[PDB]
Backbone as JSON, one array per atom type, in Angstrom:
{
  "sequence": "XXXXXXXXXXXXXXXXXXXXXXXXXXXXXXXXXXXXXXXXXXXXXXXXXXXXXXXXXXXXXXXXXXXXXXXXXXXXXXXXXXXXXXXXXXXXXXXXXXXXXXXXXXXXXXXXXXXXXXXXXXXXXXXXXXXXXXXXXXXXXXXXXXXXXXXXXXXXXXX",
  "N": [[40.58, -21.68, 5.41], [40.68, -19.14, 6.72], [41.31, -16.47, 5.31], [38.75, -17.51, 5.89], [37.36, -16.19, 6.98], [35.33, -14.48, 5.84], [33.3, -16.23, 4.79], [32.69, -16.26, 7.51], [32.64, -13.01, 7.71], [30.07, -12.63, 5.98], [28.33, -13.99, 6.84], [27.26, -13.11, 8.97], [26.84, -10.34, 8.5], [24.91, -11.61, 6.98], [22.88, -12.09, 8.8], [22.3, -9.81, 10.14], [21.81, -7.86, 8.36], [19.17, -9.24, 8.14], [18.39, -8.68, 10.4], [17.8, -6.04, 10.28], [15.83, -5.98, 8.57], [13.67, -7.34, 9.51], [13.3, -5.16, 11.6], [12.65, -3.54, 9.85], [9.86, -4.02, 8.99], [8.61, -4.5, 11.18], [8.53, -1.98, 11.52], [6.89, -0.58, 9.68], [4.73, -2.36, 10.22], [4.23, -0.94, 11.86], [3.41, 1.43, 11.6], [1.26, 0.56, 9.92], [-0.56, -0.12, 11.97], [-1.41, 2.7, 13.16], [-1.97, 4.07, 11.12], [-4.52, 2.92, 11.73], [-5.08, 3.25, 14.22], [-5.83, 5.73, 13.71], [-7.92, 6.42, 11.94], [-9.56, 5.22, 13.47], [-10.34, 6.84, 15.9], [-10.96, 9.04, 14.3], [-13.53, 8.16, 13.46], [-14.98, 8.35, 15.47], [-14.89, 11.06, 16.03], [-16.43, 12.01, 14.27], [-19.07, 10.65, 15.25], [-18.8, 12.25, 17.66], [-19.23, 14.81, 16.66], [-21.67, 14.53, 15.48], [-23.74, 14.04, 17.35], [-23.76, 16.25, 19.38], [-24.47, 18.16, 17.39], [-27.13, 17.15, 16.73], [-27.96, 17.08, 19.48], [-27.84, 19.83, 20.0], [-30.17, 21.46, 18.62], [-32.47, 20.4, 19.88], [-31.74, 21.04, 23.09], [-31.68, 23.91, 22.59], [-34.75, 24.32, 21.72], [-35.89, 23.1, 24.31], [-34.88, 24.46, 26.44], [-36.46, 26.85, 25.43], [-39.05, 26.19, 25.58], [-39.13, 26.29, 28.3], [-38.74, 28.97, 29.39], [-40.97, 29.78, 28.44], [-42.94, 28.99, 29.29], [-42.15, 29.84, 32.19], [-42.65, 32.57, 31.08], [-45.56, 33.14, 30.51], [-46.95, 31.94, 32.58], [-48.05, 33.09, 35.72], [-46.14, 31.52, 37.69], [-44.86, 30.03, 40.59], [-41.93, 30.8, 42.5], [-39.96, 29.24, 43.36], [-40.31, 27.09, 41.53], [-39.69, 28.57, 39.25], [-37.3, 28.76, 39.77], [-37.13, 25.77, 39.46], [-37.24, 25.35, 36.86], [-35.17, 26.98, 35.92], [-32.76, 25.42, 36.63], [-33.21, 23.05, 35.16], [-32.52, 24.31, 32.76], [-29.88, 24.78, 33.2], [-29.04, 22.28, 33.5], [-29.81, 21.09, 30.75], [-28.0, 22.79, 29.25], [-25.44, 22.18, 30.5], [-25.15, 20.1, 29.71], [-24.92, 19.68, 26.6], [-22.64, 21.32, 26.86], [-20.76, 19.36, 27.68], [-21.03, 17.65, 25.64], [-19.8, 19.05, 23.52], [-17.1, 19.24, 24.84], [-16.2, 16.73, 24.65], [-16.03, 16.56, 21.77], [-13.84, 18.56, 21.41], [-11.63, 16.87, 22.7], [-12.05, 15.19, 21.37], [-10.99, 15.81, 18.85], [-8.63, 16.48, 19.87], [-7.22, 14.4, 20.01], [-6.8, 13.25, 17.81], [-5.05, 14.95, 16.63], [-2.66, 14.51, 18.03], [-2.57, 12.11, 17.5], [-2.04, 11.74, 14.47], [-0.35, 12.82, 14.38], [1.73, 10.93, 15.93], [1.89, 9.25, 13.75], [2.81, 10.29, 12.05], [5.3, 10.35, 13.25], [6.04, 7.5, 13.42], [5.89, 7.08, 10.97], [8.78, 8.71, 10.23], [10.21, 6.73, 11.37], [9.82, 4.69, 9.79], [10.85, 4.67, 7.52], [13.77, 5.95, 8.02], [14.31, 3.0, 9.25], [13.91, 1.94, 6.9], [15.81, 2.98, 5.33], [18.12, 2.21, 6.28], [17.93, -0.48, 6.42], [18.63, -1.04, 3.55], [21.51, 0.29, 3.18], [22.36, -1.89, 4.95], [22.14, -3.77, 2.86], [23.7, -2.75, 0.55], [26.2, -3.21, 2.02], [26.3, -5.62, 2.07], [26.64, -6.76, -0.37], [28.8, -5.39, -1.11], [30.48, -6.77, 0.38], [30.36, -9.27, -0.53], [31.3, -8.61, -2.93], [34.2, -8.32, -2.16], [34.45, -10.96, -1.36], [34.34, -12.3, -3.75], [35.63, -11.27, -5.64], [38.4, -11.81, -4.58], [38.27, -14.91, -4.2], [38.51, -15.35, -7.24], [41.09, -14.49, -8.11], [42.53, -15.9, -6.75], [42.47, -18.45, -8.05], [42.96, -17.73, -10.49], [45.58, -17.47, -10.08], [45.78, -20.23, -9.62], [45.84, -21.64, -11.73], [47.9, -20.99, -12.23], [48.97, -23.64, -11.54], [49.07, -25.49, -13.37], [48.82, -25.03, -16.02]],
  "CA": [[41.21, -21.54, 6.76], [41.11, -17.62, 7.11], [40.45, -16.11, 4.63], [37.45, -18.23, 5.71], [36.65, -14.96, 8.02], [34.3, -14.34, 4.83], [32.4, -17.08, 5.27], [31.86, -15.44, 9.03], [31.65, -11.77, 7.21], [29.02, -13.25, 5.08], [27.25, -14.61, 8.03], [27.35, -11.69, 10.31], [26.41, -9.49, 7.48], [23.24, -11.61, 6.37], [22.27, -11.98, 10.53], [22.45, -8.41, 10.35], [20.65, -7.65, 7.42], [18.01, -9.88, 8.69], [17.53, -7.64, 11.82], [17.16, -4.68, 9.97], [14.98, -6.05, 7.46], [12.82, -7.41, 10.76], [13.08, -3.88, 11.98], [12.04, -2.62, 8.86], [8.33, -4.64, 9.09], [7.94, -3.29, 12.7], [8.62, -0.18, 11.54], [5.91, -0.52, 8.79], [3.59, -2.88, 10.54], [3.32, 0.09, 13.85], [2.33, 2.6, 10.96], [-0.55, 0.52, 9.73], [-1.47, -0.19, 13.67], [-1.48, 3.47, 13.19], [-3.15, 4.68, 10.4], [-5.86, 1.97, 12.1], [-5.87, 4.38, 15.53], [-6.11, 7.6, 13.12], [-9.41, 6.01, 11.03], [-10.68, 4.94, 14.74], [-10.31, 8.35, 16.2], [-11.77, 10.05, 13.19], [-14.84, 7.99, 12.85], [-15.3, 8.86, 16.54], [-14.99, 12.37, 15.67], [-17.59, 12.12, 13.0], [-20.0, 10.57, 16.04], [-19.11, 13.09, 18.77], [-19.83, 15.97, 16.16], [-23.37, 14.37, 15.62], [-24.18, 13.92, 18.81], [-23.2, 17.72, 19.64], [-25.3, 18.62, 16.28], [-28.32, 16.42, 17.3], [-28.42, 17.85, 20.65], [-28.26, 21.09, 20.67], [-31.52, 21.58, 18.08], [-33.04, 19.62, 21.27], [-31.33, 22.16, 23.98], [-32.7, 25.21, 22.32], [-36.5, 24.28, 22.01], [-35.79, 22.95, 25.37], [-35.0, 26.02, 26.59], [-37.44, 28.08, 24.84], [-39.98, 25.88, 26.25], [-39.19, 26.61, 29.85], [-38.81, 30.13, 29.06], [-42.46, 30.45, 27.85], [-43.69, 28.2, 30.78], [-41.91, 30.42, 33.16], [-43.72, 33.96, 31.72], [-46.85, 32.46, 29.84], [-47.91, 31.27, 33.45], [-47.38, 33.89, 36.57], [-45.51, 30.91, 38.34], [-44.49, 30.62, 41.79], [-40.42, 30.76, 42.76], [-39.19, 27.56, 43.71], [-40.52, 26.4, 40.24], [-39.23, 29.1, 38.41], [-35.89, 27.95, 39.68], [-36.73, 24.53, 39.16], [-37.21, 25.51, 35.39], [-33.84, 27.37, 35.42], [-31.86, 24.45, 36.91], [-33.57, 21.71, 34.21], [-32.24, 25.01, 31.72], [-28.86, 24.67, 33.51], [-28.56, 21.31, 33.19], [-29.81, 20.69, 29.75], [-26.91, 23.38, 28.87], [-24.15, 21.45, 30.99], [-25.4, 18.3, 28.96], [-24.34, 20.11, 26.0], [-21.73, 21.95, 27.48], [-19.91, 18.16, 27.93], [-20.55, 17.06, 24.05], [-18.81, 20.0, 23.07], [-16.32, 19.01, 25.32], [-16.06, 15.19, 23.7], [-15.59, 16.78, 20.41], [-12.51, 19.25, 21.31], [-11.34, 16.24, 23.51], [-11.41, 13.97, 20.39], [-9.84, 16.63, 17.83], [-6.87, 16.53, 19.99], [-6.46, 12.86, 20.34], [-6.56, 12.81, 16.69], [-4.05, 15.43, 16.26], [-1.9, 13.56, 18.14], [-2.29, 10.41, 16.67], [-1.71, 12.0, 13.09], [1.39, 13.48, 15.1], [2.25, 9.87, 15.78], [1.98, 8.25, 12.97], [4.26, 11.12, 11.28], [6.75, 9.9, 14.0], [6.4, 5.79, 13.26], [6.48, 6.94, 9.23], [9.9, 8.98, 10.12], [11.33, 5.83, 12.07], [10.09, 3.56, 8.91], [11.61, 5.33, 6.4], [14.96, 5.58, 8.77], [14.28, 1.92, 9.04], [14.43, 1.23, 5.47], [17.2, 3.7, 4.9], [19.33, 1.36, 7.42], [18.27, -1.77, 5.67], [19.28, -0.78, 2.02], [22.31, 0.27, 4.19], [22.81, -3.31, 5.02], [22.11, -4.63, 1.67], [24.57, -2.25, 0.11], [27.16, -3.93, 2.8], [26.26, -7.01, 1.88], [27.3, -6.93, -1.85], [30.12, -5.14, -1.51], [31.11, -7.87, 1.22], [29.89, -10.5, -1.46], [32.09, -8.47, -3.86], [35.32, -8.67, -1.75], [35.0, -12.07, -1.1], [34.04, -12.87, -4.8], [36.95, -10.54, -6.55], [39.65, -12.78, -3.62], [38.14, -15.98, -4.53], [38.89, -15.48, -8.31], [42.32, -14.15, -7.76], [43.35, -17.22, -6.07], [41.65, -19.21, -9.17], [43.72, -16.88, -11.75], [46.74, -18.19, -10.29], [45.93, -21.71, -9.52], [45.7, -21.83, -13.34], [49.76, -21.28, -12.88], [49.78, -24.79, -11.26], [48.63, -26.76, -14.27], [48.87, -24.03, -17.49]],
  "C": [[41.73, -20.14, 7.07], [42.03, -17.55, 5.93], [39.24, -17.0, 4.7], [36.68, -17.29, 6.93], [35.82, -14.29, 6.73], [33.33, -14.79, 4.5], [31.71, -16.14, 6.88], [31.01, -14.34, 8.46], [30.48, -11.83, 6.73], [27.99, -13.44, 5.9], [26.67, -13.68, 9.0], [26.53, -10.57, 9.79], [24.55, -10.4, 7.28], [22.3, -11.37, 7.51], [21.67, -10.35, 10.83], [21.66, -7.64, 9.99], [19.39, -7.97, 7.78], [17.33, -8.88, 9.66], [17.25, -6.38, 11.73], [16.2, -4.53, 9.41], [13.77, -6.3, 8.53], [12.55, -5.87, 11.05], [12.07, -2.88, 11.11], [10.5, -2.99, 9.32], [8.23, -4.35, 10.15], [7.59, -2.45, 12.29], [7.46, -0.07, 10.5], [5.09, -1.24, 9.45], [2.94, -1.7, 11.74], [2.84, 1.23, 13.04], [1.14, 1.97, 10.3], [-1.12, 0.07, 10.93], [-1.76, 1.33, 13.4], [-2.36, 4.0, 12.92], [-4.6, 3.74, 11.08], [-6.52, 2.73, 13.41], [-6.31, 5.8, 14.76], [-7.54, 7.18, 12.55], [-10.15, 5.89, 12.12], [-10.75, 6.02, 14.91], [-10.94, 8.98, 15.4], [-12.88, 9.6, 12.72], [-15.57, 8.13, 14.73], [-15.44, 10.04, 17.0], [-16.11, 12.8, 15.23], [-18.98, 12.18, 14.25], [-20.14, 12.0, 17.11], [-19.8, 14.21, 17.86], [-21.35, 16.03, 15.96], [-24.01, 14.35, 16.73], [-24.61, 15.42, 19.58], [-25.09, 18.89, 18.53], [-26.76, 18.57, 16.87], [-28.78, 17.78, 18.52], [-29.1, 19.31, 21.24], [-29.41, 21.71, 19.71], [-32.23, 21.32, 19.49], [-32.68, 20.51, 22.54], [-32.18, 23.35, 23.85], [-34.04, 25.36, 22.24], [-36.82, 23.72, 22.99], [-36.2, 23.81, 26.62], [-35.94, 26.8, 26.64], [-38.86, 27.5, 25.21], [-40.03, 26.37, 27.87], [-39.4, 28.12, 29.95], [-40.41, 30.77, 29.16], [-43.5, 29.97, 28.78], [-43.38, 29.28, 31.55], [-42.58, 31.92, 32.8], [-44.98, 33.8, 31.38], [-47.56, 31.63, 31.47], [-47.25, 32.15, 35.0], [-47.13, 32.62, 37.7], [-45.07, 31.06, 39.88], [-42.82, 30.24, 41.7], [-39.75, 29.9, 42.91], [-39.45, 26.93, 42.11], [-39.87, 27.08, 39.36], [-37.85, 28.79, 38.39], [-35.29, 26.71, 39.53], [-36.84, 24.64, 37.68], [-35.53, 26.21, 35.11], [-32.78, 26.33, 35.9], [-32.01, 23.47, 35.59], [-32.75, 22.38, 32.94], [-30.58, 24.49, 31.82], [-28.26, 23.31, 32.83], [-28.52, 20.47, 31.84], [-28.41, 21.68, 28.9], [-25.45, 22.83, 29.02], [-24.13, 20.34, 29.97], [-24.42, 18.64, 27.58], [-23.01, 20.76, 25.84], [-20.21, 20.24, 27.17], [-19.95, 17.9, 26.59], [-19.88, 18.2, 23.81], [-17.4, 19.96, 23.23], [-15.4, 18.04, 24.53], [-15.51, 15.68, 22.89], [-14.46, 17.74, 20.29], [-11.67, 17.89, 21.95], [-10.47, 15.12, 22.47], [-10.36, 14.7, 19.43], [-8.69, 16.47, 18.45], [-6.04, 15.68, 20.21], [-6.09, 12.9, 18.81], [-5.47, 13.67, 16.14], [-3.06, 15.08, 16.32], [-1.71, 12.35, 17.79], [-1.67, 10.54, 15.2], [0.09, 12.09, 13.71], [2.21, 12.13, 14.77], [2.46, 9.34, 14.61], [3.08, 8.65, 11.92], [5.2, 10.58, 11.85], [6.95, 8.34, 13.24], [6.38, 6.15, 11.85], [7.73, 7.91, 9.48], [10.56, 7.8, 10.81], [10.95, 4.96, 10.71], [10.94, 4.07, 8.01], [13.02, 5.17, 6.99], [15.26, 3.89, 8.92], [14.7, 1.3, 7.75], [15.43, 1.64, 4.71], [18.22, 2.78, 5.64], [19.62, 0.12, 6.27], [18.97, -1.76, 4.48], [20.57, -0.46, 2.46], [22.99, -0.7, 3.74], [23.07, -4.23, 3.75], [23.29, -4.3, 0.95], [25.94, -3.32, 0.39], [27.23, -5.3, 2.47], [26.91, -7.39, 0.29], [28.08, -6.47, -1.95], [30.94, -6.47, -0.6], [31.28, -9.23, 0.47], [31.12, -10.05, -2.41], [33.66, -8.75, -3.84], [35.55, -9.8, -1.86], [35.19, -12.91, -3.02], [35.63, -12.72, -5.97], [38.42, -11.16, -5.59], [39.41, -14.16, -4.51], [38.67, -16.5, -6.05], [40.44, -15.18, -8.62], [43.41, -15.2, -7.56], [43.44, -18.3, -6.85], [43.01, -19.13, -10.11], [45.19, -17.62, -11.38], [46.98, -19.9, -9.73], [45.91, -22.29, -10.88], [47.3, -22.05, -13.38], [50.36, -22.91, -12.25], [49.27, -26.05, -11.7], [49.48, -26.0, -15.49], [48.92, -22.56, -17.39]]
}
Protein backbone atom coordinates (compact mmCIF):
# COMPACT_ATOMS: atom_id res chain seq x y z
CA UNK A 1 0.00 0.00 0.00
CA UNK A 2 2.76 2.55 -1.19
CA UNK A 3 5.56 1.53 -1.20
CA UNK A 4 3.45 -0.40 -3.75
CA UNK A 5 4.48 2.73 -6.18
CA UNK A 6 7.19 -0.06 -7.19
CA UNK A 7 4.95 -2.28 -8.37
CA UNK A 8 3.78 0.94 -10.70
CA UNK A 9 7.76 1.86 -11.10
CA UNK A 10 8.20 -1.63 -12.25
CA UNK A 11 5.38 -1.31 -14.62
CA UNK A 12 6.11 1.99 -16.13
CA UNK A 13 9.66 1.03 -16.44
CA UNK A 14 8.99 -2.41 -18.29
CA UNK A 15 6.08 -0.33 -20.66
CA UNK A 16 8.89 1.78 -21.32
CA UNK A 17 11.49 -0.50 -21.99
CA UNK A 18 9.16 -2.21 -24.27
CA UNK A 19 8.86 0.98 -26.45
CA UNK A 20 12.33 1.38 -26.81
CA UNK A 21 13.07 -2.08 -27.44
CA UNK A 22 10.04 -1.71 -30.30
CA UNK A 23 11.90 1.34 -31.41
CA UNK A 24 14.96 -0.42 -31.45
CA UNK A 25 13.53 -3.17 -34.33
CA UNK A 26 12.23 -0.16 -36.41
CA UNK A 27 15.30 1.26 -36.13
CA UNK A 28 17.01 -1.97 -37.40
CA UNK A 29 14.24 -3.30 -39.54
CA UNK A 30 14.36 0.55 -41.79
CA UNK A 31 18.20 -0.29 -42.19
CA UNK A 32 17.63 -3.66 -43.76
CA UNK A 33 14.59 -1.91 -45.91
CA UNK A 34 17.68 -0.03 -46.65
CA UNK A 35 20.52 -1.89 -47.37
CA UNK A 36 17.54 -3.63 -49.76
CA UNK A 37 17.15 0.07 -51.68
CA UNK A 38 21.17 0.32 -51.77
CA UNK A 39 21.54 -3.50 -53.51
CA UNK A 40 18.41 -2.29 -55.79
CA UNK A 41 20.02 0.89 -56.88
CA UNK A 42 23.36 -0.72 -57.44
CA UNK A 43 22.23 -3.57 -59.52
CA UNK A 44 20.52 -0.83 -61.57
CA UNK A 45 23.73 0.86 -61.84
CA UNK A 46 25.45 -2.23 -63.06
CA UNK A 47 22.47 -2.25 -65.98
CA UNK A 48 22.55 1.46 -66.86
CA UNK A 49 26.47 1.16 -67.22
CA UNK A 50 25.84 -1.77 -69.76
CA UNK A 51 23.49 -0.31 -71.60
CA UNK A 52 25.76 2.96 -71.99
CA UNK A 53 28.77 0.36 -72.79
CA UNK A 54 26.65 -1.67 -75.32
CA UNK A 55 25.56 1.35 -77.05
CA UNK A 56 27.99 3.39 -77.72
CA UNK A 57 30.27 0.50 -79.75
CA UNK A 58 26.81 0.73 -81.84
CA UNK A 59 26.87 4.82 -81.99
CA UNK A 60 30.34 4.95 -83.33
CA UNK A 61 30.10 2.46 -86.36
CA UNK A 62 26.87 4.19 -86.68
CA UNK A 63 28.34 7.19 -87.22
CA UNK A 64 31.21 6.18 -89.23
CA UNK A 65 28.80 4.63 -91.48
CA UNK A 66 26.96 7.80 -92.34
CA UNK A 67 30.11 9.57 -92.57
CA UNK A 68 31.38 7.32 -95.44
CA UNK A 69 27.87 7.33 -97.10
CA UNK A 70 27.89 11.04 -96.98
CA UNK A 71 31.62 11.41 -98.92
CA UNK A 72 31.91 7.85 -100.61
CA UNK A 73 28.75 9.02 -102.64
CA UNK A 74 28.67 12.90 -104.02
CA UNK A 75 25.14 13.11 -102.29
CA UNK A 76 22.61 15.66 -102.64
CA UNK A 77 21.82 18.22 -99.43
CA UNK A 78 18.69 17.47 -97.90
CA UNK A 79 20.15 13.89 -97.47
CA UNK A 80 23.29 14.90 -96.29
CA UNK A 81 21.38 16.55 -93.52
CA UNK A 82 19.18 13.77 -93.21
CA UNK A 83 22.40 11.67 -92.43
CA UNK A 84 23.55 14.34 -89.91
CA UNK A 85 20.25 14.45 -88.00
CA UNK A 86 20.03 10.25 -87.80
CA UNK A 87 24.07 11.21 -86.49
CA UNK A 88 22.41 13.71 -84.08
CA UNK A 89 20.05 11.60 -82.85
CA UNK A 90 21.91 8.41 -82.49
CA UNK A 91 24.32 10.77 -80.24
CA UNK A 92 21.29 12.24 -78.12
CA UNK A 93 20.30 8.45 -77.67
CA UNK A 94 23.53 8.07 -76.04
CA UNK A 95 23.78 11.34 -74.75
CA UNK A 96 20.49 10.17 -72.36
CA UNK A 97 22.23 6.66 -71.16
CA UNK A 98 24.97 8.59 -69.97
CA UNK A 99 22.59 10.59 -68.37
CA UNK A 100 20.73 7.34 -66.57
CA UNK A 101 24.04 6.36 -65.29
CA UNK A 102 25.11 9.83 -63.51
CA UNK A 103 21.33 9.98 -62.57
CA UNK A 104 21.64 6.54 -60.86
CA UNK A 105 25.21 7.17 -59.14
CA UNK A 106 23.53 9.88 -57.30
CA UNK A 107 20.49 8.07 -56.16
CA UNK A 108 22.83 5.60 -54.84
CA UNK A 109 24.92 8.04 -53.10
CA UNK A 110 22.14 9.12 -51.44
CA UNK A 111 20.73 6.08 -50.43
CA UNK A 112 24.22 4.95 -48.95
CA UNK A 113 23.83 8.56 -47.33
CA UNK A 114 20.59 7.22 -45.92
CA UNK A 115 21.21 4.28 -44.69
CA UNK A 116 24.32 5.93 -42.72
CA UNK A 117 21.46 8.11 -41.25
CA UNK A 118 18.86 4.98 -40.25
CA UNK A 119 22.34 3.07 -38.92
CA UNK A 120 23.07 6.43 -36.73
CA UNK A 121 19.32 6.46 -35.42
CA UNK A 122 19.73 2.45 -34.74
CA UNK A 123 22.60 2.56 -32.87
CA UNK A 124 21.03 5.79 -30.86
CA UNK A 125 18.13 3.44 -30.66
CA UNK A 126 19.92 0.75 -28.98
CA UNK A 127 21.97 3.12 -26.92
CA UNK A 128 18.41 4.34 -25.41
CA UNK A 129 17.24 0.81 -24.90
CA UNK A 130 20.30 -0.53 -22.85
CA UNK A 131 19.48 2.90 -21.24
CA UNK A 132 16.20 1.52 -20.23
CA UNK A 133 17.41 -1.80 -19.23
CA UNK A 134 20.06 -0.28 -17.05
CA UNK A 135 16.87 1.65 -15.36
CA UNK A 136 15.19 -1.21 -15.03
CA UNK A 137 17.60 -3.15 -12.70
CA UNK A 138 18.55 -0.57 -10.77
CA UNK A 139 14.64 0.03 -10.26
CA UNK A 140 14.47 -3.87 -9.65
CA UNK A 141 17.42 -3.23 -7.28
CA UNK A 142 15.68 -0.50 -5.17
CA UNK A 143 12.70 -2.27 -4.86
CA UNK A 144 14.56 -5.62 -4.09
CA UNK A 145 17.26 -4.04 -1.41
CA UNK A 146 13.49 -2.24 0.42
CA UNK A 147 11.75 -5.46 0.23
CA UNK A 148 14.53 -7.31 2.22
CA UNK A 149 14.95 -4.58 4.72
CA UNK A 150 11.46 -4.86 5.76
CA UNK A 151 12.07 -8.86 5.94
CA UNK A 152 15.37 -8.22 8.18
CA UNK A 153 13.23 -6.68 10.63
CA UNK A 154 10.12 -8.66 10.49
CA UNK A 155 12.52 -11.35 11.79
CA UNK A 156 12.37 -8.88 15.08
CA UNK A 157 8.66 -9.92 15.35
CA UNK A 158 9.19 -13.60 15.98
CA UNK A 159 13.33 -13.96 16.75
Amino acid sequence: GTENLYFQSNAMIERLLEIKKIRADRADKAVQRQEYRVANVAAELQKAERSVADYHVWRQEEEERRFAKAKQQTVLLKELETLRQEIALLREREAELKQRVAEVKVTLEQERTLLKQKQQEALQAHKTKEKFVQLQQQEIAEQSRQQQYQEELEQEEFR
